[PDB]
Amino acid sequence: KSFVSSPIVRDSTLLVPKSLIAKPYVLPFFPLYATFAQLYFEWTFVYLGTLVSLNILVMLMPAWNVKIKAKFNYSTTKNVNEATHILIYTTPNNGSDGIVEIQRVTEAGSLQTFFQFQKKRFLWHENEQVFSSPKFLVDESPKIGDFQKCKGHSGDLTHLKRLYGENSFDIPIPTFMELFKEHAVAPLFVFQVFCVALWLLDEFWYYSLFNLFMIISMEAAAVFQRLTALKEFRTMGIKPYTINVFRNKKWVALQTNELLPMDLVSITRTAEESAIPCDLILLDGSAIVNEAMLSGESTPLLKESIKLRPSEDNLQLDGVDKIAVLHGGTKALQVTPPEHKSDIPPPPDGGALAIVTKTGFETSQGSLVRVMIYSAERVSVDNKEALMFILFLLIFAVIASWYVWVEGTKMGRIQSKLILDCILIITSVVPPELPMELTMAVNSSLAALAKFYVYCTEPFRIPFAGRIDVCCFDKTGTLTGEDLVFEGLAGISADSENIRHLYSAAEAPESTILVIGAAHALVKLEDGDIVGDPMEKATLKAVGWAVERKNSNYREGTGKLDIIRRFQFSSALKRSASIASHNDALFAAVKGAPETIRERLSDIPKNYDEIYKSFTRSGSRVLALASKSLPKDLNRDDVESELTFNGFLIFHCPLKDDAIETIKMLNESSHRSIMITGDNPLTAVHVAKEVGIVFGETLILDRAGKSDDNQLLFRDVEETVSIPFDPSKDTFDHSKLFDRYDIAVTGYALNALEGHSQLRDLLRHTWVYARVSPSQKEFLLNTLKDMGYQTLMCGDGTNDVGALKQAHVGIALLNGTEEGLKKLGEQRRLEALKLGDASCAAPFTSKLANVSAVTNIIRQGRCALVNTIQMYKILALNCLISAYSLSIIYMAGVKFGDGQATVSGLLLSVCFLSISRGKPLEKLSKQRPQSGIFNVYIMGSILSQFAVHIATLVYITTEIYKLEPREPQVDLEKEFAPSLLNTGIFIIQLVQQVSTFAVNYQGEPFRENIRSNKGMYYGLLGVTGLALASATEFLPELNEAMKFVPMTDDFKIKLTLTLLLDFFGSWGVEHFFKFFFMDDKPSDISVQQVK
Ligand code: ALF
Ligand SMILES: [Mg+2]
């Protein structure tokens, strides 16, 4: 039959529409209408009411669900030539199900049946008879022969236009009405308009009118808040610009929309506020890209061509062959034209030839944007907790409605008009805005965050950030600034009477300064700029070299130097070498970590082992410099064969100004903060000890000797204590090691301890991991998740992008300057800082440099959680109080007026306005809020406060019935007339709702006290003053204007004392339950102790 093969879909069945007669909501109902018309030709109007209600509900039901829609409207078919829709069942982790429309169109004499799901195309492959997404050639492993030989699209290419589609993000913003039409059918809005219809049937005109106005206003606000996000996602797509495209064996200038895979383009310097069109691959030339978006890093990489690789043999690896790929969405700082001639002519502009590989949403950035927009997960996915919470209130509602019905039957009330009061109560218990609470809280939190330049991409991670047990920090770029001072050269003294004897500058032998000048990766752009590693710039400026436009770097007052050919720098065998030439002869330079350089050169100074350990133990970060004279294009293992030492390079990387305070706050706020770095263990331990992650002594796990026999040693920064350990037999001693030393683990000892029984006993008591590879950070975060701890990681570069994506909440600190943002905002204003500039490296993205982003995110998540809790409690209590007051008043005849109900509504909306506003404390607290609706705190507090309120209500009702008696009459009508019961019940309801507002407000440990903020304090005092002036008859005209019967002087005392004691009882109960059951206990990892 018909299927769809794709990782998104799970199953699908074809559909075809049904005529209007056969639908379930037209034909089966005519017999019922006819039966009503026959039986009619009092008590029968309710029959017609419920009939029309069931009809409208069955008519609306297809819009709530999708399976119901496909079962009502469409009939499943198994012939692909007749269907006009298809129902797509999604996989459990990609978006939600949906119905999509099959389209047909003929091309070149053969029609092609297709549709489009989640902006991911499909087509109809006849020979397989299954809808299959387009598969690009670069996905499966190609031989680079066909990539080198490609010469652009020729002839008519409409089929490719249909298969791959245009190259542009397709994010449509719907008109306001076309979106309000989709919100007006949701179950919640339908229920609210149903309630308003009931209140109209009960002859409440002004009240229902005001309520309907409020409903419409809230829905329009929600639609605007939903449209602004779509308007924010659209800025990631660039604006099209013209690049020359090779088609039909000649250069014709096409725009960027009209690009297909395997199409030759010519890329140039990227324009302002633009990027690379699509995922290209260099075919000839050279470029220097700035992979800011995908990698969250600033240092410009250097991309190289593909022509040099052998054609028939090798395979396109995207491993070693990664210096040729150019992603989509990164800037290109400088591009150089091809050197030699080729079979194809040179482009007219100064650009380099490149081949397209992926277009549209299927590029690297495009796939992430699609998953971000369409297949995103909403907050509070379960929703069963909220539904059960609403059902509990409805149980209470039925418990009250039964008594209302029994007493209404007793007092001779008309049943036909009593069923409506039962329905009013049962529908008044239900609060409509309950499930959409966390979403509004999260939106407010996101705005308050974006005020700090901390832009977020996936917003369902905010409730995760409240209760965090472990925080992981990368060292270089996160806890340590980029700017680094230069202390001086060391170890050049051949005599070396002193170990810590440094040579500053202008005193080293000329060989050393030549080596420090020749071996660098800087380049001077044509316009005039220096782009490269900031460390090399600092070193090269401090020594006194200067880089020129051509590769020569000279004018240092000591000669002229030019760089002939250089070698790249790789993490494996980390070192960099380059070949240079001076006026006299030719030599070579090399600069890498001192360990690897040691095993390279022949002449080994007697104290080489001691010097770099003496300089690395205390803060500094050393590198080695070695050279060799070379007499007059060859391999790398020859230039690095034998070398001669020339000194060290000793840098002091200082901490960020905001690191110590952030780590101190996180340590005091019941969080455990650990370090995961890539530097050698001694520097990691020193920085961790200076910041405040380790306190006491520290032990290190490393290899014992040069033998790789997998035997570790517990060593110390000073070699005083050395405890041997063996992974095969020995097991960690708890009180001998972990209770004294706060140990730190290396990447090698972590790799050798795999499979141990005590790996998960060691991963609790260590706080510093050093020399870990980019793949082991993923393993560490996966294990810290598996143990049951929620995690956080904040890292800058590409060493830790996998870790950032694995952690529960990930932050990427994009190092920037405040004055740079000021200049950018000023230029934008003359022409805020939209999300478009933020990267796609992690969920969150701090646009500034300082580390306070972690604290800020934690604070906002915590406040969102606690605000949700208080809103749950307040809504439930107000609803229950209102329902039981309505029941007490409806048992007898009397009912509220119109103005009384409207005034109550306005006086409570006054408090609803203020209560949302709150300010968080600057310091975090040890008490973290727990997640969930069902727990002892919420249910206990709600139930007990409600017990107090019902006690008060029963007491005053007994008193009122004692003062004036009501007798059961025949054929009553619930009419409004000023009496004592109406007054008593109205004042009590209005006072007790305000009392719950004032009692269930969240206090000091999480936010600012109620007394502090005035917009709520003064509102509550105003409403209390009005209610108490009403209850005490301070103004007779005020009571007369609202039709309040004069109360006997003895009754005022009971009423006022009753309310004033109700408030105190409620306050005491809630304070008790809060002080006992509020905050959950922190984990077994975030405790502070050492002997
Ligand atoms: F210096 Al790193 F991960 F950025 F070890
Ligand atoms: Mg880093």
XYZ file of C-alpha atoms in Angstrom, residues 12 54 59 71 156 203 220 240-241 292 297 350 364 377 461 465 486 495 508-509 566 591 667 1032 1038 1067:
26
model
C 0.854 6.486 8.024
C -23.948 17.656 22.768
C -19.013 19.270 16.076
C -11.745 9.002 12.174
C 17.188 22.194 -17.863
C -29.407 37.034 34.307
C -5.040 38.550 22.408
C 19.807 36.831 -0.211
C 22.793 38.279 -2.062
C 31.366 31.711 15.615
C 34.377 30.422 19.507
C 38.418 37.851 -6.473
C 24.138 22.153 9.653
C 8.943 20.233 23.359
C 15.257 23.883 30.245
C 17.907 25.186 36.288
C 54.301 37.844 29.595
C 75.170 27.492 33.259
C 68.096 36.563 24.921
C 70.291 35.176 22.136
C 54.066 26.518 7.952
C 56.810 25.658 19.512
C 29.520 26.780 47.058
C -17.953 48.338 60.400
C -21.247 53.496 51.074
C -1.385 32.526 58.597
